[PDB]
RNA sequence: AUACAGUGAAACUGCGAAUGCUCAUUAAAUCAGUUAUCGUUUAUUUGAUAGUCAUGGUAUAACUGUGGUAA
RNA sequence: UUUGAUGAAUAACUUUUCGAAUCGCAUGGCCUUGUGCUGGCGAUGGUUCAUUCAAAUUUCUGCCCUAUCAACUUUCGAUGGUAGGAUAGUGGCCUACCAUGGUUUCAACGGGUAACGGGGAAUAAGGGUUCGAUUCCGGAGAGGGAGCCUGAGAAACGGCUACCACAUCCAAGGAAGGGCAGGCUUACCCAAUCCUAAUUCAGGGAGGUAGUGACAAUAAAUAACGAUACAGGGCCCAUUCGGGUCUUGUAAUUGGAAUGAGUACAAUGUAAAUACCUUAACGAGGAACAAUUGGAGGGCAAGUCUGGUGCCAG
């Protein structure tokens, strides 16, 4: 029923640090602001990636519903994910203490 | 300011005129009438000074074109009446027509102007995509063909409201007990 | 690990600590612009750069202990 | 005569400065197997010069009113020379030795300037008539005159002497310290940016977030729709007769439908957090989920009071 839609708009890539970049809108009619952890796993299969390496953040929902503005990433290695992320995001993802 | 008190605010003519306007358009204030008439005064003053500026002056040329076309995009002016004496000829009732609650009543989604007032503030009418709920929206042309019920409104959409569902469950309990 | 190498308080030493509020009014002064420094200084930055005793002596702080004085 | 080439240390002097008695890793090669020689790739310092960040003076270009301002400078050298000290360095910056000058109606000089001033300094006014936002104000102070101290850079004033003025603590011997907010609130974090250190981290009441704080000036809600009953009267203008007009009137009954104020799990949030945006679940029938403020006017008693030529007037 629910078109689980987060448009990962602003699509670009950075293979120096090996991570991929994209903004967030959240189009999700009759759904209340899907959470970043199930988004993490869903991004993990769509990018054939790691449950840590997925990393999106900062979501604000537009009027009229089924629209939210946020700002998202994905690493492309476990070491890059575990070292280059700031620790506040590491605890937001529950990987640090 | 955003409302200006008319300079003889209590007069036989003023007073009965506002009575007719608020009664017929379902307003609730002299303040609402005043807001419309103040901004009309600014527009029409601009047009008059433009008429003082002589024929074929570049300023008159370009800005008159601008003012006419933006008033027809707002919709109070009509397509084949493109002249500055007509922007002089406008009056308050034309904008008060273009309000939203008058427009819901005129299209026919409600019965009386007060019904349309209660609908829009009740969050059922949805211009375009959003649920608008301010009864002075000043709808344009494109939207004035696009006014209709919101898709989650139980008049043109989803499941009935809370009084209906408590009542249906109440007769369900009536049959159960 | 029979010298130590982990870790580490006290201290030596290196560098920073020269990027705080209140009170008084100047018309080539200030300020803005533009020079000059074949007339000066520079911790720092970077760049070059010196053929002209199988290892010399110290000392402290800390620690130990004994004390003074209302402090 | 051209086409092309070359240039245009000595003598000493001195507190010696020096030419590393310092951290990370090669393991080989040779035989003298000594553990001998030899060696390579990374840090901290040091000699000088360049360069960088700065700084100092300095050329010249530009800012108001006023002659009801005609004088000014040698009365700290005023102008200049020469010599020396001083300074990182020139230069009357300072001293000797001198010369006797310079500025001036092209108004020097002087006076006032509200000089919270001005600078296209500053982003501008994505169309306010000239208006916003930023930046430089300029200097001085950090009880008060005076003097000294390090560092590349301080005349540091949250070092030291003495002085003067304060004001403390005590066992009376002594000892030691420095205004700022308020009137007539001082809660979280270095997360966005930047900075600083032997520098990923440490830190930065820089920088940020939040909370008390109707003012002026905004957008809504406090109800929408329908059925039935019962009644014959309503309403507008005229100074008195009067006249004009017509679906109306009532604390009368009654039906379902709408929801937002609220109430309340989460998610989204940020260093973290509040609120927010979203979001399930509740949640409107009158004494409710109980709006004010102002104006005009009646009527009532076995009631009170006063004046009258009954029963009336005030």
XYZ file of C-alpha atoms (C1' of nucleotides) in Angstrom:
659
model
C 0.000 0.000 0.000
C 2.473 2.577 1.233
C 4.794 3.687 -1.547
C 7.842 3.677 0.705
C 9.552 6.566 -1.043
C 12.604 8.402 0.117
C 13.906 10.155 -2.904
C 17.697 10.098 -2.574
C 17.844 13.224 -4.751
C 21.094 15.145 -5.312
C 22.901 12.011 -6.523
C 26.743 12.265 -6.665
C 29.719 10.087 -5.763
C 33.154 10.356 -4.072
C 35.514 7.399 -4.481
C 38.495 9.035 -2.776
C 36.999 8.355 0.639
C 34.791 5.827 -1.197
C 31.358 7.055 -0.268
C 28.251 8.058 -2.205
C 26.209 11.193 -1.659
C 22.525 12.074 -1.986
C 19.937 14.355 -0.411
C 16.601 13.153 1.099
C 12.939 13.766 0.406
C 10.455 11.388 2.057
C 7.345 10.582 -0.012
C 5.356 8.110 2.015
C 1.603 8.707 1.823
C -0.453 7.602 4.835
C 2.793 6.775 6.682
C 4.307 8.638 9.623
C 7.958 9.447 8.904
C 9.743 6.142 8.348
C 12.766 5.719 10.573
C 16.393 5.741 9.656
C 17.174 2.187 10.759
C 14.786 0.438 8.436
C 15.969 3.004 5.931
C 19.500 1.860 6.686
C 18.733 -1.753 5.895
C 16.635 -0.864 2.834
C 19.511 1.204 1.531
C 21.782 -1.742 2.303
C 20.042 -4.044 -0.147
C 19.463 -1.372 -2.777
C 23.148 -0.528 -2.812
C 24.270 -4.093 -2.028
C 25.992 -2.629 0.967
C 26.705 -2.867 4.691
C 24.271 -2.151 7.514
C 26.776 0.196 9.066
C 27.953 1.751 5.807
C 24.511 3.141 5.086
C 24.186 6.575 6.720
C 21.396 9.121 6.220
C 20.447 11.917 8.578
C 18.644 15.167 9.380
C 15.039 14.781 8.232
C 12.357 17.560 8.171
C 8.871 16.803 6.793
C 7.116 18.993 4.238
C 3.558 20.176 4.387
C 0.907 18.290 2.590
C 2.434 15.114 4.013
C 4.414 12.405 2.297
C 7.491 14.607 1.864
C 10.497 15.068 4.174
C 13.786 16.944 3.752
C 16.966 15.221 4.981
C 20.540 14.624 3.958
C 22.116 11.213 3.292
C 25.270 9.209 2.659
C 26.616 5.732 2.266
C 30.148 4.521 2.811
C 31.660 1.882 0.609
C 33.881 0.106 3.139
C 33.552 -0.963 6.757
C 36.812 0.763 7.742
C 35.715 4.024 6.139
C 32.372 3.752 7.911
C 33.932 2.937 11.274
C 36.651 5.589 11.194
C 35.369 8.560 9.244
C 32.091 8.977 10.944
C 31.881 11.528 13.742
C 31.004 9.950 17.028
C 27.708 11.766 17.482
C 26.518 10.103 14.315
C 28.129 6.909 15.543
C 25.907 6.993 18.614
C 22.874 8.145 16.609
C 23.426 4.886 14.719
C 24.298 3.234 18.021
C 27.807 2.216 17.080
C 29.651 4.252 19.698
C 29.280 5.081 23.345
C -0.214 49.036 9.525
C -1.955 46.379 7.519
C -5.457 47.747 8.018
C -6.362 51.390 7.581
C -9.362 52.977 9.068
C -11.461 54.740 6.474
C -11.495 58.409 7.066
C -15.194 58.731 7.931
C -15.593 55.322 9.491
C -19.064 55.856 10.888
C -21.396 57.237 8.256
C -24.805 56.208 7.018
C -23.378 55.139 3.664
C -20.253 53.414 5.026
C -22.125 51.604 7.634
C -24.951 50.150 5.613
C -22.460 49.269 2.885
C -20.396 47.176 5.192
C -23.539 45.538 6.444
C -24.363 44.373 2.974
C -20.875 43.194 2.225
C -20.297 41.153 5.339
C -23.733 39.669 5.243
C -23.466 38.577 1.673
C -19.928 37.304 1.685
C -20.017 35.874 5.181
C -17.200 37.823 6.684
C -16.833 38.713 10.277
C -15.109 42.098 10.412
C -14.767 45.581 9.215
C -11.118 44.579 9.440
C -11.498 42.088 6.616
C -13.247 44.593 4.443
C -10.582 47.119 5.232
C -7.693 44.898 4.282
C -9.112 44.355 0.829
C -9.973 47.981 0.268
C -6.604 49.233 1.428
C -4.704 47.134 -1.004
C -7.117 48.084 -3.767
C -6.405 51.710 -3.013
C -2.701 51.140 -3.495
C -3.222 49.371 -6.831
C -5.624 51.920 -8.176
C -3.452 54.807 -7.065
C -0.597 53.265 -8.996
C -2.766 53.019 -12.064
C -3.859 56.632 -11.798
C -0.340 57.949 -11.605
C 0.390 55.795 -14.592
C -2.399 57.585 -16.443
C -0.813 60.889 -15.514
C 2.319 59.624 -17.239
C 1.705 60.486 -20.835
C 1.041 58.296 -23.824
C 3.924 56.230 -25.220
C 6.176 56.909 -22.353
C 8.324 53.785 -21.937
C 7.595 53.610 -18.222
C 3.848 53.756 -18.804
C 4.131 51.225 -21.603
C 6.058 48.521 -19.816
C 4.598 48.914 -16.369
C 1.024 49.117 -17.586
C 1.573 45.850 -19.409
C 2.951 44.395 -16.202
C 0.083 45.534 -14.019
C -2.623 44.360 -16.386
C -1.121 40.947 -16.923
C -0.529 40.251 -13.312
C -4.064 41.242 -12.440
C -5.432 38.891 -14.997
C -3.238 36.118 -13.636
C -4.803 36.856 -10.242
C -8.058 36.663 -12.097
C -10.000 39.692 -10.974
C -9.579 41.159 -14.432
C -10.863 39.492 -17.563
C -8.928 38.473 -20.663
C -10.504 40.786 -23.186
C -10.602 43.900 -21.033
C -6.925 44.805 -21.141
C -6.767 48.505 -20.362
C -5.823 50.812 -17.534
C -9.178 52.461 -17.398
C -10.505 49.058 -16.425
C -7.940 48.674 -13.703
C -9.323 52.013 -12.647
C -12.830 50.628 -12.840
C -12.361 47.792 -10.324
C -13.885 47.877 -6.799
C -13.886 45.899 -3.547
C -16.526 43.351 -4.392
C -14.351 41.854 -7.111
C -11.604 40.855 -4.706
C -14.134 39.752 -2.145
C -15.401 37.540 -4.889
C -12.018 36.039 -5.384
C -11.762 34.953 -1.740
C -11.811 31.275 -1.103
C -14.916 30.737 0.955
C -16.986 32.543 -1.598
C -15.419 30.343 -4.202
C -16.333 27.122 -2.485
C -19.909 28.300 -2.162
C -20.023 29.450 -5.765
C -18.638 26.246 -7.195
C -21.173 24.355 -5.159
C -19.378 22.247 -2.660
C -21.489 23.722 0.135
C -24.819 25.371 0.443
C -24.361 28.682 2.159
C -21.397 30.915 2.558
C -21.290 30.076 6.210
C -21.190 26.400 5.321
C -18.180 26.986 3.155
C -16.565 28.911 5.992
C -16.976 25.980 8.305
C -15.713 23.504 5.729
C -12.511 25.334 4.986
C -11.748 25.881 8.631
C -12.674 22.290 9.230
C -9.834 21.218 6.886
C -11.835 19.547 4.196
C -11.261 21.748 1.151
C -8.003 21.161 -0.627
C -6.897 23.468 -3.382
C -4.375 21.853 -5.635
C -2.489 19.532 -3.332
C -2.463 20.880 0.232
C -5.263 21.225 2.729
C -5.830 24.940 2.809
C -7.669 26.183 5.830
C -7.614 29.964 5.680
C -10.871 31.403 4.406
C -9.234 34.264 2.536
C -6.942 32.422 0.242
C -7.515 34.565 -2.903
C -7.628 31.708 -5.361
C -6.233 32.296 -8.850
C -7.589 30.965 -12.142
C -5.820 27.629 -12.342
C -6.717 26.783 -8.827
C -10.303 28.116 -9.127
C -10.831 25.261 -11.461
C -8.896 23.020 -9.064
C -10.807 23.524 -5.798
C -12.215 20.311 -4.334
C -12.395 18.007 -1.346
C -9.369 16.686 0.383
C -8.613 13.007 -0.211
C -8.681 12.283 3.504
C -11.862 14.216 3.941
C -14.808 11.969 4.745
C -16.884 13.899 2.245
C -14.735 13.032 -0.716
C -12.436 10.382 0.601
C -11.495 8.071 3.407
C -13.319 6.497 6.343
C -16.090 8.389 8.142
C -15.342 10.752 10.971
C -15.263 10.178 14.655
C -18.889 10.944 15.433
C -19.997 8.554 12.724
C -17.720 5.794 13.897
C -18.602 6.144 17.573
C -22.220 6.031 16.474
C -21.881 2.978 14.275
C -20.044 1.233 17.087
C -22.777 2.375 19.453
C -25.497 0.718 17.406
C -23.134 -2.236 17.080
C -23.146 -2.411 20.882
C -26.908 -1.935 20.760
C -27.259 -5.054 18.633
C -24.628 -6.901 20.668
C -26.132 -6.163 24.076
C 62.545 -8.715 30.759
C 68.214 -10.091 36.110
C 68.513 -2.157 32.709
C 64.092 -0.320 31.293
C 60.495 -0.588 27.261
C 52.610 -0.966 29.096
C 50.704 2.854 31.830
C 51.376 6.890 34.856
C 50.663 11.182 39.234
C 54.534 15.097 41.469
C 58.377 17.828 38.857
C 62.692 19.402 34.716
C 62.462 21.326 30.030
C 60.129 23.406 25.055
C 56.136 26.854 23.366
C 51.761 29.639 23.945
C 49.586 32.664 27.529
C 51.013 40.067 23.020
C 43.862 37.107 18.894
C 39.326 41.951 28.653
C 35.611 46.163 29.834
C 35.255 51.200 31.295
C 36.340 56.432 30.414
C 38.375 61.161 27.024
C 37.444 64.025 20.679
C 41.524 65.225 17.007
C 39.881 68.756 10.511
C 47.232 66.837 6.603
C 45.723 65.106 12.708
C 43.314 60.702 11.794
C 41.548 57.791 7.859
C 41.372 56.118 2.856
C 44.651 55.787 -1.408
C 49.468 55.621 -3.307
C 54.791 55.120 -2.661
C 59.922 54.225 -0.632
C 62.956 51.233 2.533
C 70.849 50.918 -2.234
C 67.797 52.840 4.995
C 65.602 48.779 9.047
C 63.585 44.143 12.211
C 61.421 39.326 12.332
C 59.772 33.753 16.897
C 56.897 30.973 12.809
C 56.307 29.043 7.220
C 58.568 26.796 3.335
C 63.744 26.712 0.255
C 68.792 26.159 0.199
C 72.970 26.035 3.229
C 78.816 24.065 7.490
C 85.678 17.976 6.234
C 88.589 23.215 8.660
C 84.778 10.848 22.220
C 82.788 2.196 22.998
C 81.074 9.015 25.076
C 83.635 14.493 30.150
C 81.472 16.625 34.651
C 77.281 18.230 36.960
C 72.470 19.111 39.886
C 67.601 19.353 41.371
C 62.625 18.718 42.053
C 60.138 14.941 44.028
C 61.019 11.280 48.230
C 62.708 10.327 53.496
C 62.854 12.425 58.067
C 63.066 16.430 61.712
C 60.876 21.208 62.887
C 59.101 26.200 63.501
C 54.613 29.726 63.555
C 47.986 32.053 64.984
C 49.590 32.222 59.249
C 85.558 47.909 -40.376
C 80.928 43.211 -38.497
C 78.702 38.276 -37.557
C 79.861 36.365 -32.284
C 82.614 35.668 -27.547
C 85.651 37.164 -21.774
C 85.997 39.966 -17.541
C 85.195 45.029 -16.434
C 91.478 38.720 -0.232
C 95.294 40.840 3.394
C 96.310 42.759 8.332
C 94.665 41.986 12.753
C 90.518 42.578 16.769
C 86.921 39.323 20.619
C 83.929 36.210 27.228
C 83.641 32.376 21.442
C 79.567 31.328 17.479
C 80.415 27.213 15.796
C 81.528 22.251 12.577
C 74.755 17.718 16.930
C 78.059 13.928 23.408
C 69.553 13.847 20.710
C 64.654 10.184 19.025
C 62.153 5.847 14.491
C 63.798 1.557 11.656
C 67.867 -1.353 7.911
C 70.795 -7.160 8.656
C 73.232 -7.300 4.883
C 78.087 -7.655 3.018
C 83.104 -9.500 4.480
C 86.306 -12.415 7.785
C 90.079 -10.351 11.294
C 83.520 -14.177 13.523
C 85.230 -9.809 16.241
C 79.191 -9.997 17.918
C 84.640 -6.619 13.911
C 83.813 -3.493 9.951
C 80.452 -1.356 7.097
C 76.244 0.742 5.648
C 70.648 2.538 4.111
C 65.049 4.650 5.003
C 62.072 8.132 9.183
C 62.166 12.606 13.971
C 64.239 16.825 17.124
C 68.300 21.015 16.712
C 72.080 24.198 14.793
C 75.209 28.242 10.669
C 73.596 31.727 7.164
C 70.652 33.561 3.392
C 66.157 33.739 0.944
C 60.859 33.573 1.462
C 56.413 33.931 4.492
C 53.492 36.338 8.767
C 54.118 40.757 10.699
C 56.084 45.579 12.276
C 58.363 50.367 12.053
C 58.983 54.851 9.822
C 58.004 57.337 4.697
C 56.558 59.687 -0.797
C 52.380 61.749 -2.614
C 46.850 62.061 -3.108
C 42.357 63.595 -0.987
C 37.553 66.069 4.687
C 33.645 71.223 7.466
C 32.401 76.624 9.248
C 34.853 81.219 9.971
C 39.403 87.055 8.765
C 33.471 89.126 14.205
C 40.775 85.014 13.445
C 46.990 88.614 10.507
C 50.101 87.004 12.212
C 53.049 82.464 13.726
C 57.387 80.075 14.997
C 62.774 80.429 17.785
C 59.873 81.286 25.448
C 62.029 71.327 24.196
C 65.724 73.521 17.687
C 61.861 77.543 15.444
C 65.007 76.510 9.641
C 69.382 74.478 7.929
C 74.579 72.856 8.161
C 78.784 69.912 10.522
C 80.145 66.244 14.336
C 78.656 62.674 17.916
C 75.532 59.880 21.072
C 71.129 57.137 20.821
C 67.926 53.729 18.095
C 66.913 47.525 14.789
C 67.395 52.247 11.138
C 67.556 57.473 8.733
C 66.401 62.120 10.608
C 67.659 68.391 15.399
C 65.259 62.218 17.565
C 69.173 64.402 21.299
C 73.986 67.356 22.506
C 77.919 70.318 20.974
C 79.625 73.765 16.912
C 77.191 77.042 14.272
C 74.507 79.922 10.352
C 69.210 83.159 11.240
C 65.494 81.159 9.660
C 60.590 79.001 8.083
C 54.472 79.774 7.237
C 51.144 83.677 5.450
C 45.995 86.541 2.489
C 46.769 81.222 -2.988
C 43.912 83.762 4.715
C 49.099 80.847 7.334
C 47.458 81.055 11.985
C 43.291 81.066 15.184
C 38.267 80.080 16.627
C 33.804 77.252 16.783
C 32.483 72.051 14.433
C 26.584 68.892 18.083
C 34.340 65.209 15.313
C 28.264 59.101 18.672
C 31.803 61.803 13.496
C 33.037 60.208 8.680
C 35.208 56.825 5.316
C 31.314 53.949 -2.367
C 34.943 51.457 4.567
C 30.923 48.301 3.931
C 27.166 44.313 1.514
C 24.082 47.089 -0.740
C 18.320 49.012 -1.276
C 16.728 41.363 -6.735
C 11.980 48.371 -7.084
C 11.945 51.926 0.799
C 12.781 57.865 -3.054
C 18.398 57.194 -0.590
C 17.121 52.875 2.885
C 19.141 48.756 5.268
C 23.373 45.337 7.134
C 28.905 45.171 8.210
C 33.697 47.408 8.973
C 37.670 51.669 10.792
C 36.087 55.324 15.009
C 40.881 57.778 17.328
C 43.227 57.445 21.996
C 43.685 56.386 27.052
C 42.742 53.490 31.552
C 42.622 48.647 34.300
C 43.481 52.580 43.049
C 46.905 57.104 41.828
C 51.779 59.798 40.059
C 57.219 57.373 39.437
C 60.784 53.520 38.057
C 62.204 48.268 36.435
C 61.843 43.367 34.519
C 60.970 38.886 29.702
C 59.581 37.654 24.988
C 60.066 37.656 17.717
C 56.418 40.969 18.727
C 54.290 44.437 25.323
C 56.424 50.214 27.603
C 52.026 43.344 29.526
C 49.740 47.226 33.887
C 45.422 40.391 36.503
C 55.159 40.751 37.835
C 58.642 43.896 41.369
C 60.535 48.212 44.344
C 59.405 52.755 46.822
C 55.449 56.403 47.280
C 50.345 58.162 48.323
C 45.361 56.824 49.112
C 42.248 52.898 50.252
C 40.226 48.586 52.802
C 41.142 43.773 55.417
C 42.805 39.257 59.289
C 44.930 38.301 64.390
C 46.860 35.670 69.738
C 48.609 43.106 68.717
C 54.245 40.142 67.314
C 52.628 40.484 61.956
C 50.211 39.283 57.094
C 47.743 40.101 52.562
C 44.649 42.021 48.891
C 42.265 45.282 44.258
C 35.937 46.699 40.770
C 31.716 44.284 37.824
C 26.683 43.775 37.121
C 21.116 45.581 39.231
C 17.314 49.226 40.588
C 15.754 54.328 41.402
C 18.428 34.842 34.259
C 24.043 34.172 34.565
C 20.854 26.760 32.068
C 23.910 22.438 27.819
C 28.066 21.607 24.210
C 32.974 22.341 21.345
C 28.277 19.795 17.394
C 28.055 24.460 12.341
C 32.293 28.005 11.622
C 37.051 29.399 12.880
C 41.405 29.374 16.217
C 45.650 27.676 19.482
C 49.121 24.327 21.618
C 54.881 19.180 21.975
C 48.717 19.509 18.222
C 43.361 14.218 14.914
C 41.612 14.189 20.379
C 43.223 18.730 24.682
C 40.912 23.593 24.736
C 38.488 27.991 23.013
C 31.056 31.537 29.382
C 35.482 32.547 21.153
C 31.406 30.284 18.303
C 26.726 27.824 18.867
C 21.674 26.014 21.261
C 17.912 26.669 24.938
C 14.903 29.110 28.879
C 12.119 33.756 31.684
C 10.199 38.435 28.261
C 0.470 39.979 25.924
C 3.286 45.485 24.358
C 3.254 47.595 18.193
C 1.798 44.787 14.149
C -0.693 39.112 11.788
C -4.179 34.379 10.777
C -8.319 31.473 12.605
C -12.344 29.157 16.303
C -16.536 29.858 20.054
C -20.650 26.242 15.625
C -22.828 24.274 10.010
C -27.067 21.515 7.938
C -32.249 19.440 8.110
C -37.028 17.858 9.858
C -41.617 18.854 12.782
C -44.968 21.559 15.604
C -47.891 25.682 17.265
C -49.558 30.629 16.498
C -51.669 35.523 13.256
C -49.735 38.863 12.783
C -45.110 41.275 11.513
C -42.400 45.505 9.639
C -41.177 50.686 7.461
C -41.890 56.102 7.393
C -45.079 60.622 9.192
C -45.551 66.348 14.068
C -51.895 64.488 15.642
C -55.548 62.184 12.948
C -52.643 58.754 9.902
C -50.303 56.203 5.698
C -47.290 52.121 3.200
C -46.363 46.747 2.890
C -46.033 41.316 3.391
C -43.933 34.606 4.922
C -44.002 35.451 9.475
C -43.155 34.631 14.456
C -41.540 31.143 19.188
C -36.059 30.162 25.897
C -41.662 24.859 21.156
C -40.213 19.843 20.225
C -36.703 16.654 17.547
C -32.670 13.994 13.838
C -27.886 12.569 12.252
C -23.227 14.473 10.258
C -18.752 17.510 10.876
C -14.433 18.515 13.986
C -10.446 21.718 16.874
C -9.057 23.284 21.460
C -7.654 19.628 24.186
C -6.145 14.573 26.022
C -2.328 11.262 24.503
C 2.029 6.195 22.200
C 5.705 6.722 18.823
C 8.793 8.616 14.642
C 11.359 12.916 12.778
C 14.678 16.023 15.348
C 19.970 18.136 17.914
C 26.534 17.602 20.850
C 22.270 16.288 23.647
C 17.633 18.636 24.395
C 12.798 21.815 24.271
C 9.381 23.190 21.002
C 8.322 22.225 16.246
C 6.613 19.145 11.263
C 4.192 14.325 11.226
C 1.471 10.514 13.719
C -1.828 6.351 15.584
C -6.105 6.472 20.249
C -9.583 9.440 22.887
C -12.011 13.868 22.637
C -19.196 19.011 21.660
C -25.024 19.019 23.000
C -25.843 23.180 26.863
C -26.111 24.385 34.329
C -20.825 22.627 27.448
C -15.356 22.546 26.049
C -19.629 28.519 30.199
C -16.404 35.926 25.299
C -16.120 40.475 26.925
C -16.845 45.725 26.634
C -20.097 49.861 26.066
C -25.000 52.332 25.044
C -30.505 53.416 25.254
C -35.109 52.275 27.619
C -39.204 50.433 30.211
C -42.153 48.007 34.125
C -43.172 46.296 39.689
C -44.802 46.579 46.189
C -50.344 46.117 51.636
C -42.205 49.480 50.412
C -39.710 54.308 51.727
C -39.207 60.141 51.276
C -40.688 65.331 49.922
C -44.187 69.190 47.987
C -49.235 70.347 47.243
C -56.186 73.744 46.640
C -59.078 65.719 47.608
C -57.814 60.335 44.206
C -52.331 64.120 42.143
C -47.212 65.771 41.132
C -41.798 64.989 42.241
